[PDB]
Amino acid sequence: SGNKVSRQSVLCGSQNIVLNGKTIVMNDCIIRGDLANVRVGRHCVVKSRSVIRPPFKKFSKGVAFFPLHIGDHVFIEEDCVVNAAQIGSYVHVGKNCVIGRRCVLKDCCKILDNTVLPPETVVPPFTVFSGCPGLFSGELPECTQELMIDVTKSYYQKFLPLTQV
Amino acid sequence: AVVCVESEIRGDVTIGPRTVIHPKARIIAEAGPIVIGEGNLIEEQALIINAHPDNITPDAEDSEPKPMIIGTNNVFEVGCYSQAMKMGDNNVIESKAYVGRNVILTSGCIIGACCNLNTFEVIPENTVIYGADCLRRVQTERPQPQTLQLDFLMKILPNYHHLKKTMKGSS
Amino acid sequence: EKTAVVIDLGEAFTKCGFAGETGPRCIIPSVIKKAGMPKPIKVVQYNINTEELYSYLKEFIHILYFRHLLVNPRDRRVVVIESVLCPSHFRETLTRVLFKYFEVPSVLLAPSHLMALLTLGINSAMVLDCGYRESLVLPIYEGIPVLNCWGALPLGGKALHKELETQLLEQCTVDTGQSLPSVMGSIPEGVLEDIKVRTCFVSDLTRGLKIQAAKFNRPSPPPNVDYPLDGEKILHVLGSIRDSVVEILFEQDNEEKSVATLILDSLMQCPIDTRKQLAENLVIIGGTSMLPGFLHRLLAEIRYLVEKPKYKKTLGTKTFRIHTPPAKANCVAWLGGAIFGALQDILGSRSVSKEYYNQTGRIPDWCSL
Ligand SMILES: Nc1ncnc2c1ncn2[C@@H]1O[C@H](COP(=O)(O)OP(=O)(O)O)[C@@H](O)[C@H]1O
Numbered sequence A: 001s002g003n004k005v006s007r008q009s010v011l012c013g014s015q016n017i018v019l020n021g022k023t024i025v026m027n028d029c030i031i032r033g034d035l036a037n038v039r040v041g042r043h044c045v046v047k048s049r050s051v052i053r054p055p056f057k058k059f060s061k062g063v064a065f066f067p068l069h070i071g072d073h074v075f076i077e078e079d080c081v082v083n084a085a086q087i088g089s090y091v092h093v094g095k096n097c098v099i100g101r102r103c104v105l106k107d108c109c110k111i112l113d114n115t116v117l118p119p120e121t122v123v124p125p126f127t128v129f130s131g132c133p134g135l136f137s138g139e140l141p142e143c144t145q146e147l148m149i150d151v152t153k154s155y156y157q158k159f160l161p162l163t164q165v
Numbered sequence B: 001a002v003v004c005v006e007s008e009i010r011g012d013v014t015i016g017p018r019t020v021i022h023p024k025a026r027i028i029a030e031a032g033p034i035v036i037g038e039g040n041l042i043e044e045q046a047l048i049i050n051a052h053p054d055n056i057t058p059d060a061e062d063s064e065p066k067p068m069i070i071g072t073n074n075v076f077e078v079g080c081y082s083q084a085m086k087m088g089d090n091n092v093i094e095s096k097a098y099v100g101r102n103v104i105l106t107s108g109c110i111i112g113a114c115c116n117l118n119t120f121e122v123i124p125e126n127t128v129i130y131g132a133d134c135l136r137r138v139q140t141e142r143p144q145p146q147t148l149q150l151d152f153l154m155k156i157l158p159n160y161h162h163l164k165k166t167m168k169g170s171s
Numbered sequence C: 001e002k003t004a005v006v007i008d009l010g011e012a013f014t015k016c017g018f019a020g021e022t023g024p025r026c027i028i029p030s031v032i033k034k035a036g037m038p039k040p041i042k043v044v045q046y047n048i049n050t051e052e053l054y055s056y057l058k059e060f061i062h063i064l065y066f067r068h069l070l071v072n073p074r075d076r077r078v079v080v081i082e083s084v085l086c087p088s089h090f091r092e093t094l095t096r097v098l099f100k101y102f103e104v105p106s107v108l109l110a111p112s113h114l115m116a117l118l119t120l121g122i123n124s125a126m127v128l129d130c131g132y133r134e135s136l137v138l139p140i141y142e143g144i145p146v147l148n149c150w151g152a153l154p155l156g157g158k159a160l161h162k163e164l165e166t167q168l169l170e171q172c173t174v175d176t177g178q179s180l181p182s183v184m185g186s187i188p189e190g191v192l193e194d195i196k197v198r199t200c201f202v203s204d205l206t207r208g209l210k211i212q213a214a215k216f217n218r219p220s221p222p223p224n225v226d227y228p229l230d231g232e233k234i235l236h237v238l239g240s241i242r243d244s245v246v247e248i249l250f251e252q253d254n255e256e257k258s259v260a261t262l263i264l265d266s267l268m269q270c271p272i273d274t275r276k277q278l279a280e281n282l283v284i285i286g287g288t289s290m291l292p293g294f295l296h297r298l299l300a301e302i303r304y305l306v307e308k309p310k311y312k313k314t315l316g317t318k319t320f321r322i323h324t325p326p327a328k329a330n331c332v333a334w335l336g337g338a339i340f341g342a343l344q345d346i347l348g349s350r351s352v353s354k355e356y357y358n359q360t361g362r363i364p365d366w367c368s369l
Helices: A142-158 B151-169 C051-068 C090-104 C112-120 C157-170 C189-199 C203-217 C238-251 C257-267 C272-280 C295-305 C329-343 C354-360
Strands: A129-131 A135-139 B019-021 B040-042 B091-093 B109-111 C005-007 C013-017 C027-029 C031-033 C040-042 C077-083 C106-110 C125-129 C136-140 C226-229 C235-236 C282-285
Touching: A135 C077, B019 B151, B040 B151, B040 C031, B091 C051, C005 C257, C005 C329, C013 C051, C013 C329, C027 C051, C031 C051, C031 C125, C040 C106, C090 C106, C090 C354, C112 C125, C112 C329, C125 C257, C125 C272, C157 C189, C189 C282, C203 C295, C238 C257, C257 C272, C257 C295, C257 C354, C272 C282, C282 C329
Parallel strands: B019 B040, B091 B109, C005 C077, C077 C106, C125 C282
Antiparallel strands: A129 A135, C005 C013, C013 C027, C031 C040, C125 C136, C226 C235
16 A cells, blocks of 8 residues: 555565555565564554564463554654564654563553563553663653654655655 | 575584574574584574684684584574574573674573673573673573473473474475 | 651652651652763752752652652642751752742651651660761750761761772772773762672671781681673672771771761760760661671770770760661661651641741741741
8 A cells, every 4th residue: 555665575474464554665674474463554654674573373272472463653663673562553663672572562652762671561552661671761742642653654655665666 | 304495504504303494594504514403493584603704803723623513492583693602402592682602502591682692601501691781690590401491491492393383384 | 637748868869758658669869860961960969050950859859759659749748858968048949849839738857867766766866877978976865956966077988989999990800891900981889889789798896907907917808709790891809898998987097087986076075964865875877887797896896986095984884775777777767757747747837838938938947037
């Protein structure tokens, strides 16, 4: 849809990836969509050179690590690591970050750059997280969250066709 | 072992059994013969190295003639490299671990996220490092080399076993 | 009714909790982690712009009640655990933040030793506070804190940290990445403090004599464990090092300046009654005092210093029975503030009313009017 397919789009079994409207399909990343699911949504903005892959598909007898969980209109940065997380919608992600073990972020929850979290992490709605361990930077403003969502979709659709062959 | 076609190997690497290398498993074992273990899972985006060449230039009597090795249940995750890690029994390497040169990884080794391994440091058993706190010898007995961290490693290995059969069937 | 805001303070920390709160809800230092600024800017600043401090006060007090309280204190009073020697103008800047900015009901200023007296439930007392950067002895004459007799000297852990950095200049076997004597420039004293928390053990008085031998004409460096810092920085420190930093607390050669000197002389200005009183009416507060093997070695040296020539005659034979804190000596002061704010709602009259500061804009301290 809105995500203009990049010229160098490559991934390893990316069967779970949505054609998000008003987005920007970035290259240099990876996606293990054939393994499990991922909650993709329209109006988002994902950067390049990312590290995306589903954690598991609840590989234990009960319920192990789920696929993923994410939202729409989120502001995703670059070089982040996604593993055992549960993100929300219109969230401003951090650059070169890493998803904590059993992480859970609600909608518009801001993320710090190069930040991670410990085992069994959680985050509230429009709550800024931080630290190498599970830490909270603060809270994100809802007005700034919707503004970042709209500006992210705008800049995504703007720079989406940049040599996206 | 799952010798994946996408698993890019290089050089003479006499691997071992159950060394399921996942897709895009870029490696190098030419200047040092890296033998794989029994019960690991070489995930995507890895980087196995062998004999750091003359770019760094070891001007200290380069007469190495030493090959790398591996161990049982030592599954290394994505992002993390492998700069000739002399591993052992159940030494898992999580995401983005900057593997160091001379780190004799013993048992119960939980290589945390973004933990640059210490060169010329004897990695003893039963020690899990912290993420932001580098060289944290926390959990000296909780992360025990046998029955605690190795038991947790064998427990995580079950999903790796189901994934091993699934990847062998999906291919 | 309402639980008054009991807030501990000091050179190093700033703790808080409800009225009658039994437990360290949190521990905040006496600094402010300024946004944008890589280091947490302190608040214990003197001869400085009280306006930027006013900003620190507004923001810090705001988030401070959000830390220890998570609720607006405009309903209940605020127990302000002060201590003397702080700039009263700065104290009024705090007051204007309270009343003129947050419009709190009423507050009251009380020293630490007063709350210590509240904890022991006694009246006379000879108590010393082991402050961060200083020393603070305060005698009480049956509920009356003695003015002319006191203790206040720059004799705290901060100077000991300076001594620690001196040892870091001397004793430094930081491995490569293997000595590296203070090659790295600055030192994080907070990290050094927690290093002391996990390492600074305290020796014996005879070992204090061993340290005296180490000064002129070496004994028992163990127990001693090295210190590994992240980034290939491992170095060893002897036990004699940290014990030397503890033992140097009594250098009285040609100056006669120490802790016991201050205590003894403070008692020297006391009268006959107060002498035997403070001998039995004796307690010690302060967090710095809480060291392993220091209070008894300390006490032994105190009893030894009773044998000093001008003290056997004058003071001499006096039982120095000491009260003990029911909890951590540092927190015991905050606990005394909790004691006061817990069951004393009647004493709101003594608490500084907001109204007076509204119609006044000031508060006359212990001066005229
Ligand atoms: N358990 C302890 N052992 C040694 N020193 C301590 C302990 N607890 C606190 N301290 C130190 O003693 C001092 C007393 O704390 P605080 O009330 O913050 O002092 P001040 O009033 O001078 O700031 C602080 O410097 C603190 O670092």
